[PDB]
């Protein structure tokens, strides 16, 4: 289930980095799959079996435990693709590249950063990245917030919780 500019992030929203797009959850929600977000479970119990306890991690019965989904490894308390187990990126994260039959772990970088081909394609080179998100909601546009691109309020507008739409002048 690839993530593109037309993906619907249920209970989440799209973000864009130097070389990929993904869904980021709202509030305290965690990823169940690549484009759905649900409430997490703090303490895995017998009632919590098969319920999400983190990003790409469900509670399973040994008995209670929070294990990563198939194809994910728990590296630094975060479930990441197994191909990324040994890939450190610096100013970015490791993503699963499927452009070739043999998959690889490659770095995707914060806005302003690009894979430095002289540094194992780690995020140690300054480079441009044009936003491609479709910010179609009212008074919204693509902005660089905390290293990632996202649809946010245009300058002079804030989200009011009485309507959840960017408001101002």
């Amino acid at each position, epitope marked *: 289930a690839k993530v593109t500019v037309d993906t619907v992030c249920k209970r989440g929203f799209l973000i864009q980095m130097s070389g990929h797009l993904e869904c980021k959850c709202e509030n305290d929600l965690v990823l169940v799959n690549e484009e759905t977000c649900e409430e997490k479970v703090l303490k895995c119990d017998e009632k919590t079996v098969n319920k999400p306890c983190g990003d790409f991690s469900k509670c399973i019965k040994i008995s209670y435990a929070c294990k990563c989904n198939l194809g994910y490894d728990m590296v630094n308390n975060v479930c990441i693709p197994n191909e990324c*187990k*040994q890939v450190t990126c610096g100013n970015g994260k490791c993503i699963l590249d499927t452009s070739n039959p*043999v998959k*690889t*772990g*490659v770095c995707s970088c914060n806005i302003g950063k690009v894979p430095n081909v002289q540094d*194992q394609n*780690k995020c140690s080179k300054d480079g441009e990245t044009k936003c491609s998100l479709k910010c179609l909601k009212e008074q919204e546009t693509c902005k660089a917030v905390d290293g990632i691109y996202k649809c946010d309020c245009k300058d002079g507008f804030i989200i009011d919780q009485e309507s959840s739409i960017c408001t101002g002048t």
Partner: antibody
Amino acid sequence: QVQLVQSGPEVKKPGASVKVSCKASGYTFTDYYIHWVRQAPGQGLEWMGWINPNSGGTNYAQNFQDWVTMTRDTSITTAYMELSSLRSDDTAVYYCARDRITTAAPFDYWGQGTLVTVSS
Amino acid sequence: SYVLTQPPSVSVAPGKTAKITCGGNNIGSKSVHWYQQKPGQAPVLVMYYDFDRPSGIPERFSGSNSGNTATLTISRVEAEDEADYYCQVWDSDRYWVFGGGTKLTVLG
């Protein structure tokens, strides 16, 4: 189709040098390392080093740099491995291989290997 | 240098399960790649990032990696699986490492 085609077998005297080529095709040359792996007859695989086709940079395995020079020609997408001051013990099959420029990517494509035979 | 230790030889009966091990200090933290090499041929990737199976490799091949031992498991071994098998990890001190290799002999 990704292909790594090496040059043919070589028979050399001690003290000579040989230059083995690795012709790459079917993929973006500058996106993948070119590794060289040594296999003496009856022995195991021995990583010798890589060359970065982009910057031309090299990363030699411990002490192989004393007699091995890795070069590349982006113009014709060929990497080269030059063995200097050959000794009979250098007899081996030499392979080239590629992996995506990143951390710990697998060697998904290998050349057919070149047998270098060194004998007085 | 980082040391990968493989058994020099493994023997199994046809149709039985074979297990090739690759020892290393906390090898669970490294992505292990496995290469099969038959006589006269270049090595061939048969398992990568511990358990990803390349397209074209039989489902009898499975990979695992936990603690201090990465394992290549070949269930229902056929005679064509008789070859040398090499594991491979990257060490963050900037060098690749091949294991010693395991000769797989199919009895019968």
